[PDB]
Design a protein around this nucleic acid. Sequence first.
DNA 1: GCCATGGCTAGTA
DNA 2: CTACTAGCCATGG
Length: 108
Amino acid sequence: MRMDEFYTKVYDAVCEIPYGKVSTYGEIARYVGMPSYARQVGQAMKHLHPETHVPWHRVINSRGTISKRDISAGEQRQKDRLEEEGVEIYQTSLGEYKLNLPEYMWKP
DNA sequence: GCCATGGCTAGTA
DNA sequence: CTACTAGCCATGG
Ligand SMILES: *CCCC(=O)c1cccnc1
């Protein structure tokens, strides 16, 4: 599997998340058959044009939260996009935007 | 090669 | 609950 391949598969996968459902770096990395690739699942998302028509927002972390970004908190997008999707999120005690994984969670 | 860097994760404590 | 740890692994200097 070339990376250019990984990347698309992932994309396809991530594109199979329904409105208002989410999934998780890890899972999608499993789903496409690369269980050790959660990081790289992220790298894929990070690597997308803002114009993209791909539900990049529907992919948080297995700890049930939205991942912090050393590409600065512009990810606040994620929260919002999710809020529009219809997703109850709350702040913790470092805001760590958080949602009920079991509730909102994709399961083919 | 080394090293440092990430939208990660599972296991401890 | 949080707060560290291994491990993980492509990527870019
Ligand atoms: C992985 C998605 C990042 C991205 O393209 C984006 C961030 C903020 C606003 N629009 C797009």
